[PDB]
Structure formats: C-alpha cells, structure tokens
Write an enzyme that holds these catalytic residues in place. Structure first.
Site, PDB file in Angstrom:
ATOM      1  N   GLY A   6       8.064  34.392 -23.543  1.00 40.51           N
ATOM      2  CA  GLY A   6       8.137  33.743 -22.249  1.00 40.51           C
ATOM      3  C   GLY A   6       8.489  32.261 -22.401  1.00 40.51           C
ATOM      4  O   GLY A   6       8.980  31.686 -21.435  1.00 40.51           O
ATOM      5  N   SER A  34      10.549  31.366 -24.667  1.00 40.02           N
ATOM      6  CA  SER A  34      11.859  31.503 -25.282  1.00 40.02           C
ATOM      7  C   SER A  34      13.013  30.922 -24.468  1.00 40.02           C
ATOM      8  O   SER A  34      13.031  31.001 -23.240  1.00 40.02           O
ATOM      9  CB  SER A  34      12.051  32.967 -25.563  1.00 40.02           C
ATOM     10  OG  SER A  34      10.911  33.400 -26.276  1.00 40.02           O
ATOM     11  N   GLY A  35      13.920  30.253 -25.175  1.00 36.61           N
ATOM     12  CA  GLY A  35      15.030  29.562 -24.553  1.00 36.61           C
ATOM     13  C   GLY A  35      14.678  28.165 -24.110  1.00 36.61           C
ATOM     14  O   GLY A  35      15.603  27.435 -23.786  1.00 36.61           O
ATOM     15  N   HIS A  46      19.145  35.220 -26.758  1.00 35.83           N
ATOM     16  CA  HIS A  46      18.229  36.330 -26.583  1.00 35.83           C
ATOM     17  C   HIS A  46      17.734  36.456 -25.143  1.00 35.83           C
ATOM     18  O   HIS A  46      17.206  37.500 -24.751  1.00 35.83           O
ATOM     19  CB  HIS A  46      17.116  36.073 -27.530  1.00 35.83           C
ATOM     20  CG  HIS A  46      16.290  37.217 -28.052  1.00 35.83           C
ATOM     21  ND1 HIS A  46      15.095  37.002 -28.607  1.00 35.83           N
ATOM     22  CD2 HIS A  46      16.592  38.561 -28.043  1.00 35.83           C
ATOM     23  CE1 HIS A  46      14.623  38.167 -28.948  1.00 35.83           C
ATOM     24  NE2 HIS A  46      15.526  39.078 -28.606  1.00 35.83           N
ATOM     25  N   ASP A  84      20.913  31.575 -32.009  1.00 30.34           N
ATOM     26  CA  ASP A  84      20.276  31.891 -30.758  1.00 30.34           C
ATOM     27  C   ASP A  84      20.428  30.760 -29.736  1.00 30.34           C
ATOM     28  O   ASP A  84      19.579  29.871 -29.541  1.00 30.34           O
ATOM     29  CB  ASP A  84      18.831  32.192 -31.043  1.00 30.34           C
ATOM     30  CG  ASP A  84      18.156  32.908 -29.898  1.00 30.34           C
ATOM     31  OD1 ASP A  84      18.804  33.347 -28.936  1.00 30.34           O
ATOM     32  OD2 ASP A  84      16.951  33.082 -29.946  1.00 30.34           O
ATOM     33  N   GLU A 122      10.231  23.021 -10.831  1.00 28.97           N
ATOM     34  CA  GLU A 122       9.027  23.822 -10.777  1.00 28.97           C
ATOM     35  C   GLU A 122       7.866  23.220 -11.504  1.00 28.97           C
ATOM     36  O   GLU A 122       8.042  22.496 -12.485  1.00 28.97           O
ATOM     37  CB  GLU A 122       9.259  25.171 -11.391  1.00 28.97           C
ATOM     38  CG  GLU A 122      10.170  25.999 -10.555  1.00 28.97           C
ATOM     39  CD  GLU A 122       9.407  26.804  -9.516  1.00 28.97           C
ATOM     40  OE1 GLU A 122       8.357  26.415  -9.001  1.00 28.97           O
ATOM     41  OE2 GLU A 122       9.921  27.873  -9.207  1.00 28.97           O
ATOM     42  N   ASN A 138       4.245  24.893 -10.492  1.00 33.68           N
ATOM     43  CA  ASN A 138       3.565  26.146 -10.318  1.00 33.68           C
ATOM     44  C   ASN A 138       4.657  27.181 -10.092  1.00 33.68           C
ATOM     45  O   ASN A 138       5.282  27.200  -9.049  1.00 33.68           O
ATOM     46  CB  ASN A 138       2.671  26.109  -9.107  1.00 33.68           C
ATOM     47  CG  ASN A 138       1.708  27.290  -9.084  1.00 33.68           C
ATOM     48  OD1 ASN A 138       0.513  27.158  -8.874  1.00 33.68           O
ATOM     49  ND2 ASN A 138       2.119  28.520  -9.233  1.00 33.68           N
ATOM     50  N   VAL A 168       3.867  29.253  -6.563  1.00 36.17           N
ATOM     51  CA  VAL A 168       3.561  28.645  -5.263  1.00 36.17           C
ATOM     52  C   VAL A 168       4.755  27.745  -4.946  1.00 36.17           C
ATOM     53  O   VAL A 168       5.180  27.046  -5.867  1.00 36.17           O
ATOM     54  CB  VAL A 168       2.261  27.761  -5.355  1.00 36.17           C
ATOM     55  CG1 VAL A 168       2.077  26.874  -4.135  1.00 36.17           C
ATOM     56  CG2 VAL A 168       1.068  28.671  -5.459  1.00 36.17           C
TER      57      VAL A 168
HETATM   58 CU   LIG Z   1      15.235  41.297 -28.822  1.00 34.26          CU
END
Ligand SMILES: [Cu+2]
Ligand SMILES: [Cu+2]
Lengths: 223, 223
Positions: free
Chosen positions: A175, A177-178, A40, A84, A52, A54, A57
């Site tokens: 957000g 997701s994955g 998705h 998925d 990562e 932040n 920044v």
């Molecule tokens: Cu969708």
C-alpha cells in the site's frame, strides 16, 4: 508505514493516492500534469487523488483527476522488480497551491547516511494488515549498499537502494508502494519491495530515482 | 492461510469466495441458496463465487451468483467483533454437484482437542501480504478456552473460540475472514480476527457457530 507518525495535515504536498475504487498505491507529483510511481502499481484505469490527508473523509483540499497515459518503464521486469518505475500523465493539469505541490527530481544520487522522509497510506503492522485513514510519515536513512546486498543476497541491482533500519520496527509496507522517499527536497527513491515489513535485517528496498532522471525527462518531452 | 498447504482441487466444496471486483472474504455454502460468512465482510453488493480452486483462472467449475439479501446479525458490534456472523441469500439456487456442496451446521459445540480444517484465499505471510491464487488449507485444533482467554485478556466473549497453535507459524489471516472451520463434517467456526497472523501466543479467534444455529435457522425461515 510501520512504526511511523501521522503527518501534519498536507505537510507532504506532493504525495498522491492512486485509487481504483480503493487506495492501492502512492506516487509523487513532479510537475502539474505528471506523477511518478512504481511500475508494479500499473492498472488499466487509475484515478489520481491529490491534496489528501484522510483518505476516507472529504476535508476540502482534494483534487481527483484521471490518468490519461500510464507509462511503465520499457525494461520493468516483474520477477526482480528491477526498473520499478512508472510515469502517469493526468487528463488535466492540477492547480498547484499550498496543499498540492511538486517535488524536485534529484541533481545526483544521495549518499549513505542521508535522512529521508517516506510517506504513505500503506499497511501499518509488521504482521497482519491494518490500513490507515491518515497519511503516515517516517524519517529514515539511506543505507550502505553493502548492507542492502548483505540483507538480500543476489537480489539488489544498481537501480535499488535500501532505506530503513536493520533493527526492524519501522519500514514502509504494502500500500505504500510507488510512494516517495524525499531527502532534502528531491525525490531519491520510490517504495518498491522488501521481505516482510519492518522485520530485523530486512530493510525496505527502493527504486533509485537518480538513475532515471534522463528517462523521466525524455518520456515527459515525448508525450 | 499462513503455513498451510494447497488444497486438492475442489476438495473443500462448500468454500465460497466473496468478490466485489476482487476477493476480500470467504464463506460457506450451507444449503443451495444460502452462505454464512462474517458480519465484518459486509458490503452493499457482493458476487458469490463457488466451485473455485484458482481464484484467477477459469477452470470450468465456477458458478458466479449475486447476493440478493445480505443479513448481518442484529447484535454485531464492530468494536469487539462480537457476533461476527452474516447470512447471504443468493439470487438463484446454485446447482449442487461434486465440486459445489453444502456443509452441515453443528449438532453441538466441539470440544478442545478437535482437529478442524480451515481454508481460504487469505494472506499467506506472517509479515507483509501475499495473496495466493490457489485455495489453501490448514489442519488445526480447537484450543482450550482458558488459553484463548490468556492470549487475549478481556477480549474473548462466549461467542468466540480459538483454533490454532500457540507456537505460531500457522494460522488464518486477512482475506480468510468469513471462511470455514469444519471439524468432522460440521461448521464449528467462522474466520474472524486475532493479533497479527501466525505469531506465537496469538492464536486466531473464530466465531463459535454452535451458539447461532437457532438464529441461522429462524433467519433462513423468515426470508
Ligand atoms: Cu506483483
Ligand atoms: Cu473493521
């Protein structure tokens, strides 16, 4: 992540951010050139951001790399979000170090009762949206399949597993997701869907990664 | 818009979509070269999309135009979202017709009890996010200022007005921001903020446009 805590800086070193001019999904680094994420989260061009903490920044440990092949599973169905899962091959291997590392694939399917760690830069509210800067973390158990099924009547396939709390308050959200759910060292789930975020009786549902170890390996081998 | 209905195609002809490769805010067309929106929707480059119904399909009435000057109010404060209003001057005047038209500025401040129309392509869920294709509409009344103040203790300035239902279920949400609340023909409010979306006792709060008619006019005159 709703109801979670800010992860210690670079304590989740396999976590990546998929960015297309903004952060839209997460993923996990499983070897120096491949990321696994949700089908998705497909987009034609993706920049993968590693090291990562932040997201807004530059702290000095980032490695930004473009995706060279972006491979959704052949049988991904967007209507049920069944299967998925997506593999991303990076343009170049990344340099692995303390802050950028791999997570192991599962040797078997984890049992109900296992505590797992979920992380992401996804939405932090059960109502409205607030996108966080700093990576968020949540400790949550794998739920019994019959509670998953009870919460989502007729929508859970054998490739899905619920992780979370039936009381609500704490869950992943859009957000995230994955991104990864890791239960003592192995990737057992991928953030996928759920009704709402952190609602009572609506736990999050995850792609059950132990069902795909052979697909992931063949696909890497062949590409 | 949470708990709203799909607007009849091009029945809200002043509604615009602010796009920077994706839809992120709304606005209103107040004359053939100027849009008013929220200062919180500021971005360095904006393409304004007019004549839209389905944000993802070209239906044949769209006019896409770039923003030439993007002017936030001098006293906008991002911490309180006080003075959340911004003017956008388009690169070219648009061609006004049945599906692309102007909304009048207020002759006075509207009283509590007025039914208003709110529209947008913002989030449609009170928990989680779902972005709609088709423009959404909501009929909602202006609330008494003391109910606004009771819901958000110490956060409501004289430049804010609550519109909505204290019972929850129906409200604007993220992505509606900067868009119109029109109460019999005049723009009376701009979508701004609120706690959550459609929660009980957490009505949406809007920039009170009647407090800015002089600023809007001087700014247009001078630019
Ligand atoms: Cu969708
Ligand atoms: Cu902000």
């Amino acid at each position: 992540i709703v109801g979670g805590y800010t992860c210690q800086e670079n304590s989740v070193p396999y976590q990546v951010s998929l960015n297309s001019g903004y952060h839209f999904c997460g993923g996990s680094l499983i070897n120096d050139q491949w990321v696994v994420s949700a089908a998705h989260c497909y987009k034609s061009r993706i920049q993968v951001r590693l090291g990562e903490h932040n997201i807004n920044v530059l702290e000095g440990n980032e490695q930004f790399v473009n995706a060279a092949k972006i491979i959704k599973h052949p049988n991904f169905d967007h209507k049920t979000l069944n299967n998925d899962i997506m593999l991303i091959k990076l343009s170049s291997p990344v340099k692995l170090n303390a802050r950028v590392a791999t997570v192991a694939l599962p040797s078997s399917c984890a049992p109900a009762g296992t505590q797992c760690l979920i992380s992401g830069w996804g939405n932090t509210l059960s109502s409205g949206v607030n996108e966080p800067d700093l990576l968020q973390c949540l400790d949550a158990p794998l739920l019994p399949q019959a509670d998953c099924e009870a919460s989502y009547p007729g929508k859970i396939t054998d490739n899905m597993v619920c992780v979370g709390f039936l009381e609500g308050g704490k869950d992943s959200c859009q957000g995230d997701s994955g991104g990864p759910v890791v239960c003592n060292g192995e990737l057992q789930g991928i953030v996928s869907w759920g009704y709402g975020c952190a609602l009572p009786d609506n736990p999050g549902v995850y792609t059950k990664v132990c069902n795909y170890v052979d697909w992931i390996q063949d696909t890497i081998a062949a590409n």
